[PDB]
Amino acid sequence: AMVPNVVVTGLTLVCSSAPGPLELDLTGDLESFKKQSFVLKEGVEYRIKISFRVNREIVSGMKYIQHTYRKGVYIDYTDYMVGSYGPRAEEYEFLTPVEEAPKGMLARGSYSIKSRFTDDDKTDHLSWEWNLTIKKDW
Template structure:
């Protein structure tokens, strides 16, 4: 198991190799609101995009706080939900069982506290017996601060299927943004089986 920083760095490096994208310079929320004050249409556009100013935001914590990750599947007996606010090492001790060959979606619950976050994305890499099997990147987009929790539903994916695909997988997950900020990194396990248990 790698530490959170190492996995986030590797996570970001993989993305940089695939994309030749240079994000714009980071600006504070106040700087963005002060720009183009004379242009009424831009002011309205910013108000629509940013919404009402966030009150009751957590100024002491990180700018982005990911609270939960849910794995949703129509065939599952119940959704699999991970609480990401507590002891993340406890998730490495658990194993979530998924049936082979089923479609699922990941739903991310998060809160943006102070500044706009640009290019927020979720990424995970799946390992089996120490060998990298697959990876997934889900571009979530850019968000302004809000008092309430926000949600994002990733595109559908499918679990591996077949006798050789069954078994235990270690997942290394992280949340990063275009400004190379790593907000959360953790490990968890899934067990691919013939049936839901």
């Protein structure tokens, strides 16, 4: 240990209709993300791919948590059970089930997400904040 056991290395919005890549480098400057926003066109299916490495010891009950806010109102909580993961050379990938972005004048606009990748030791392997804007078009 000088290296954390679990290092969350990236976040990718998987959308087969997206024009450009939608990816966060989670090994950098986490605060610059709140200053930005990914634009997702309304009513597109997507998944969230989380990249992470395990470095020294097995970690059980890994879980991906998202808190969604809309202009400060708490609007949703979603989690995904990732499972148990051992130390390995290759980094790991987890994908969330398919979700849809909402539609309509009402639902369009900017969302604030607080993410946490945790496990049954309740370890903050990383927490980060990012923004999503739903537009009429890409």
